Every structure is written in structure tokens, then in C-alpha cells.
Design a binder for these strands. Structure first.
Lengths: 63, 63
DNA sequence: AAGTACAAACTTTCTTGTAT
DNA sequence: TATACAAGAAAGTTTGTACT
């Protein structure tokens, strides 16, 4: 899902949610809600795909 | 400018607002908020760049 | 301590209807 | 016909707190 892919992703890189956000330049909260399934399309969607270093499509559809 | 660029392709590509909208899966009225600086980060940024057949970075950074 | 969640108030982006 | 405006709501963001 986008929420899941992200959580696993954010982990192969070790970043906890607090530093992940640090990197997209956004709250710890916002990173949370996303993982948690309480947001489908975080306005910061291209900022976090840089970070995970995967491409938005992949993040979005899991390809 | 996000909306510059956007506008300019549609004219290029030969469609009007609606078309493309119906194409992007959105609305004539949405293609306006964006196009007319009324929107920055659309929930269709992505679905639009494929439609718009250019890069999502390109829409924002135009880079 | 450290890190992940929660929930309310506010903000942007969407949606529908009509005006130009 | 084709682009624009405008009011209500929804989807996201915030920020302060709370859990564990």
C-alpha cells in the first residue's frame, strides 16, 4: 500500500519516523499518519520518494 | 511556473482544459485551479504528468 | 528516555454550480 | 463552446500531548 511500502522502506534505511520527516522537511506526525493509513496522498509525495529513493509511481502502486 | 508549464503543454498537445481533465481523471474546474495558480500540490500531480507525459519533477521544478 | 500515536483546529485542494 | 469564479466540504497538515 503506500502506507506500508513506505514503513518497510523507511526501515531498510534505518531512519525512524522522526528523521525521515527531518529529510522531507515535515512533521513527525505527518510521516506517521501516512504509514498508519490515515492519508492517501501526502502533498509531500515527491519529497518522500527522493528520500526513500524510489519513484512516486512505485510508492503509489507498488508496481 | 507550475501553472505556466502545465498550460503550455496542453496547448501544445492540442487539448483543451476538460479533455485533458477527463484524461487526467479530474475536472475542468481543477485544471483551472492549478493552471490559474489556484493550486500548487494537486492530488493528481502524478496522474497528470503521465497524462501530460512529462516528469513530475518537471511540473514543480521544471527541472 | 526515545519514538510512535492521537485528536482537534486550521489550511489547501476538490467538487459542483453557475457566471463570463 | 471554452475558461473562470466562488462557497461548502474533505482531504491533508499542525501542534501540542499522550502513550508505551
Amino acid at each position: 500500500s503506500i502506507s506500508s511500502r513506505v514503513k518497510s522502506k523507511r526501515i531498510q534505511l534505518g531512519l525512524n519516523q522522526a528523521e525521515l520527516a527531518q529529510k522531507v522537511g515535515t512533521t513527525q506526525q505527518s510521516i506517521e499518519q501516512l504509514e498508519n493509513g490515515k492519508t492517501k496522498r501526502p502533498r509531500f509525495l515527491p519529497e518522500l520518494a527522493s528520500a526513500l529513493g524510489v519513484s512516486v509511481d512505485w510508492l503509489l502502486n507498488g508496481t
